[PDB]
Amino acid sequence: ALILTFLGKSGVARTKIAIAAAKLLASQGKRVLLAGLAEPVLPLLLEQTLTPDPQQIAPNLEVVQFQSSVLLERNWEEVKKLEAQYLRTPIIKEVYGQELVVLPGMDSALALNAIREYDASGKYDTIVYDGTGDAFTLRMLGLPESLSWYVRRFRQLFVNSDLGKTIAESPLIQPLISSFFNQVNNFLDKGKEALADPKRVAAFLVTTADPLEVVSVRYLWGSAQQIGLTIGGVIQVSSQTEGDLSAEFTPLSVTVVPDVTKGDWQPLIDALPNFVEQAEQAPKPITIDTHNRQVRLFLPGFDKKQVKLTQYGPEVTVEAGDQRRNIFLPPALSGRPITGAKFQNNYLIISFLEH
Amino acid sequence: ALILTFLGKSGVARTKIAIAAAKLLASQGKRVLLAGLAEPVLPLLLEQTLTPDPQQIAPNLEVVQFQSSVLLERNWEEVKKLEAQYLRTPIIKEVYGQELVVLPGMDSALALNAIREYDASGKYDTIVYDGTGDAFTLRMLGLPESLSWYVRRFRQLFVNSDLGKTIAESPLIQPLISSFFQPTNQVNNFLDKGKEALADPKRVAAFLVTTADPLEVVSVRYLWGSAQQIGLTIGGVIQVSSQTEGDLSAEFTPLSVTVVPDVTKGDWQPLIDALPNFVEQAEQAPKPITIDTHNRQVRLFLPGFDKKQVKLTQYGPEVTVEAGDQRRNIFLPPALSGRPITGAKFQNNYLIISF
């Protein structure tokens, strides 16, 4: 499925857009899941009580509310089943899933895993996700890449090292495991390949003509590029500020849409863009030119003072918008000092030494 | 210090109110730190470039911007020194802070710890925190209690298990730990101090921010109850302008609703002059939880929920209150510890639980 989401500073407008996008796509024969968070506006705008299980509200249109409490207790039962299997003496079987308290980070991990399950079921063409629309959403969506980076470092250290041997053989720990007792990369790589594919994950900016909102979504735009999230376009919603925003979002299409009054969704529905086509035509977050030995990063919303580069062996780290892209350099670039990092037309062009 | 924050659906209004509150309290002689996250509105409204370190911008007014990437990197250097101090062969000494990736949850822990450090320094009377103003801010502020509960439900399960009683009754452990290189009290002391502060309206308080749009009103009422679940005092409501007219006093009884004007073209004085007395309203507001030793009762303030969506259960050693997609595991104090529940009821937005 395509995971479709929206970024912007005003939650009510984002929810209306998500609802309208879901209605439009379901009306065209796409199988749609609209998923929101634990908050009362989506139910109220739909005039429907929502639950942690998808409910059909129209042909091809199901709606679900992610309640982290419920997702946590559902995952906890999977933890118990694994515990019985892999342990001779249970330890956490006592704890009921209804007791567990949601910690920061769990919220995003549980929501992303739920989305992954819905995506993997094959039941949907589009999963419209009405999230927080902000940097927390980006950190969620970036989990496949972020976890992959950690896994690759753990492997380098706690194993794939003498330490990996001083425990792999340790006659001290071996009996301790014998008592009471990768697939990971295929799992993460699937998430990574989806996130990078605009046919599988795309987001759209939502903003009024207020310059404060405009600068906020341009910052989110650049931050999204750091994680490889395609930004397909801009939805411009109404306010007391008038303005043509096309020049502020070149080369993206800006689509001006009307409000929703008294539950008449049709004018908004009719004004929405073709999300799939615009995502497919949007700029690419990263390209690598192996002949000229250059990395080209699309980084709208930032200038050179706001972007930091770090280069440690075969890895380059790009930090911008409080996000970090780790670039593992290919053979044409590895081992060569960076000789330039200059912005041209919202792209940062990183050059590597030829001589 | 007092940590003061704002909950609401529109970030721009929340940042404006945070700036005005900081300017107000500073002009009254309080030493103020204004702290925001990685986003461009606060610097633009202040006409000041912001950094990860406090900058004075007016008498008694310093401002700082939290960047998760920098907080993580600065925490890493402390982890790397501990390696040099308590481990035979370093493992992580070659991992560089610039490369670390911020995962979900990590961002919230790093920011709360940064706040903790600024509060511990004694340099400020008020810390005005411009956060995300939503459930994610609540899960962050609730960390001391949530962590305390995990330590308290699971320590016993792991120490008294067959595998735990073996780690104490096994000679394969002592020469294991020494192959490299009570905390339970130090941890609970650190956690209990955070829980104490959060429960004290002089140390932590939040105010709701909303327009008259019924959709915003219902949203902040839900956040209001969600905040009570974590023990966060909600001192009052700030009503900002919109195309919807309305007196909101009856919607938030017994809280004061203070109507405030916009800020246009750098003129902060109308907003400043309209802000409420934060300290006094927080002192007068309802208490999230009261334990009545005499009447053997626990009274939980739970406004803004559907009563059918408040669940009380005792699956484990403590009663669990589920509401607002948050869970409170009630630690019974001495006067109530070990007394069965004998009833519970709702009344004027309070859940009264009898023992």
Residue numbers in the entry:
A (entry chain A): 2 to 182, 196 to 369
B (entry chain B): 2 to 182, 193 to 366
Task: Provide the authors' original text about this structure.
We solve the atomic structure of a plant Get3d and further refine a previously deposited structure of a cyanobacterial Get3d. In AtGet3d, the α-helical CBD is enclosed by additional helices not seen in the deposited Get3d structure from Nostoc sp.. With this map, we could clearly identify additional density consistent with the helices of AtGet3d that enclosed the CBD. We built into this density adding 41 residues total and further refined the NosGet3d structure with refinement statistics in Table S1. Overall, NosGet3d is structurally very similar to the AtGet3d structure (backbone RMSD = 2.33 Å). As with AtGet3d, NosGet3d has some unidentified densities in the hydrophobic chamber. One prominent difference is that the helices enclosing the CBD in NosGet3d are further from the bottom of the chamber than in AtGet3d, resulting in a larger hydrophobic chamber. In cytoplasmic Get3 proteins, it has been shown that the highly conserved aspartate in switch I coordinates a water, helping to align the water for nucleophilic attack on the γ-phosphate. This aspartate is conserved in the Get3d family, with NosGet3d uniquely having a glutamate at this position, further supporting its evolutionary drift. The catalytic aspartate in Get3, D57 in yeast, coordinates water and primes it for nucleophilic attack of the γ-phosphate of ATP. This residue is highly conserved in Get3d proteins; however, it is a glutamate in NosGet3d, which may contribute to its lower Vmax. To investigate this, the ATPase activities of AtGet3d and NosGet3d were determined by monitoring the phosphate produced by Get3d in a spectrophotometric assay. Both AtGet3d and NosGet3d were found to have ATPase activity, with a Vmax of 12.0 ± 0.1 and 3.2 ± 0.1 nmol Pi/min/mg Get3 and kcat of 1.10 ± 0.01 and 0.28 ± 0.01 min−1, respectively.
